[PDB]
Symmetry: D3
Amino acid sequence: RSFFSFLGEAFDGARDMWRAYSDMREANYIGSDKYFHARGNYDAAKRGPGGVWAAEAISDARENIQRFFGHGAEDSLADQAANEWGRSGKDPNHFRPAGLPEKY
Amino acid sequence: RSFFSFLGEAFDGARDMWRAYSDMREANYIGSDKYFHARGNYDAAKRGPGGVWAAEAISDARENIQRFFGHGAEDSLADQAANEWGRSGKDPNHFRPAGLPEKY
Amino acid sequence: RSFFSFLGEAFDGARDMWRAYSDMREANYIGSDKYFHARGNYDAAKRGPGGVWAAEAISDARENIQRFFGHGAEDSLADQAANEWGRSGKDPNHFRPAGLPEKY
Amino acid sequence: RSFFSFLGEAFDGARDMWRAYSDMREANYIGSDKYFHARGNYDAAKRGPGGVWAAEAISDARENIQRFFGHGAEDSLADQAANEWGRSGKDPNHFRPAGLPEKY
Amino acid sequence: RSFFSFLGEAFDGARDMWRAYSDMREANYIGSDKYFHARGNYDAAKRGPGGVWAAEAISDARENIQRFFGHGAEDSLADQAANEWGRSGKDPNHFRPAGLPEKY
Amino acid sequence: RSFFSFLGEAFDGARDMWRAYSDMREANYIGSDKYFHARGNYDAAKRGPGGVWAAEAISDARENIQRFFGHGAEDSLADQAANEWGRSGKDPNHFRPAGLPEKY
């Protein structure tokens, strides 16, 4: 039964990762990147082990795709630290920009 | 226009990775793991950059999921080397088991 | 980065279009067609350019499928005007039936 | 038009069935199985005929997959009765565990 | 590891079931229904246990959807026997119509 | 029953449209655009009415997405004529470049 739960946690983790980027686009707040990268990872990790796995799979692929197209080396490191913070169960609101609406 | 090719190459790379594991199940040949972990990576990489990205995203996730459930540390390293060989465009038949049918 | 945002806006636009028809079925209000056709298009357009594109792709296909099966010519024109109203950022509540619940 | 509505009801029924198991994992309440099996089926059936069809397709497949892996015969019968109760429009809260949060 | 094979066998079984109906539409041979309802079940079952499960899940849903729309009771029984024959690994060409092309 | 064939023809038409662009990337032949924009439309239309509908839905969306990103007005017209030729069941090899391999 644990395998089927792990997969459900993974798809749910995938949806929470998607929700973070969907919200990032909606907010349109400059310098919110770190907050949503931590939140999607935090939410996915909260689903369980499948969520942790899905968040890491999605974060690594995103980082690699941006790298290929022209995303700066130092800029990728900041994205990497924000993902790890959330995934480790630490508070995403740590990277929260001051004027971001309560919904996010 | 290079962005859509990249995505098409990625989905195609994803299908070639799927095809490798689908074939691995069909063959039912003991030792295969490596050859196939490397055929899928070779075929996906051949699609273009999107295929390389998709093969790596899929290989890393597979390795991590196997690790969580109970796959041995040394056993994962062999799977890792096999994936890299194929993805780098080197010949997969290098890891080919002697009694494997021509179709694979 | 704009291409990846355009695709996210498109999938989100696709979900908002789906949500409009899902809600239309739930409400079961006679003569609500115009309201939900405008709302799904309005919501999708609000996501951004990807949403505008997805709303138009979905609206054109829906109109063409109904035409093939037996939907009246004049009946299609009313569906067409309602989609355009919403997509152009104009208020969907313009086509709102008087006894429709607040949730919709 | 009824066929397209039946399919929309089915996908929506599929989502309500998924939502029940996603919620079951979130709650982590022991002996909640019956409640969520009835709720997902009740919610899906409420969508319409497509929802009834999708709930039954999903419930039968779930029951068969668990049977193959090692789920007890008597244990499957309890899962079967809970699915039927909900699908028939009877109150899921009938199987509600006393300390389960209001959201579920 | 038997869990992932089961899922891969299921998706592959799902594709073989799809392929049977896709081919049924292509052939446009009157009487086919049975042979094809049984070729798809045979191919899916050949994938392994996941394929058997997927063929049965797909066959039961198809039978139920056809029943709701207006498919005759006696007509459903013939479809039921044809599915079982294939799924049990028996030769599908048993129900083969005389003038059906070699590709099918 | 004509409704399910229509949907199956549509998904199959969608796959044939995908196959055309997947092949276009593989070939890497300069000028192809048209032949392929017309092979996919021909193959999809051959599936039946669902295929015709899916080819048109896909062709219109592709044309609109290309327009938004920076595709020239005159360049879009050539893509439009090529799609119509194929979809109308006329021979795609009409736009075939002289040095294109036999597989395509």
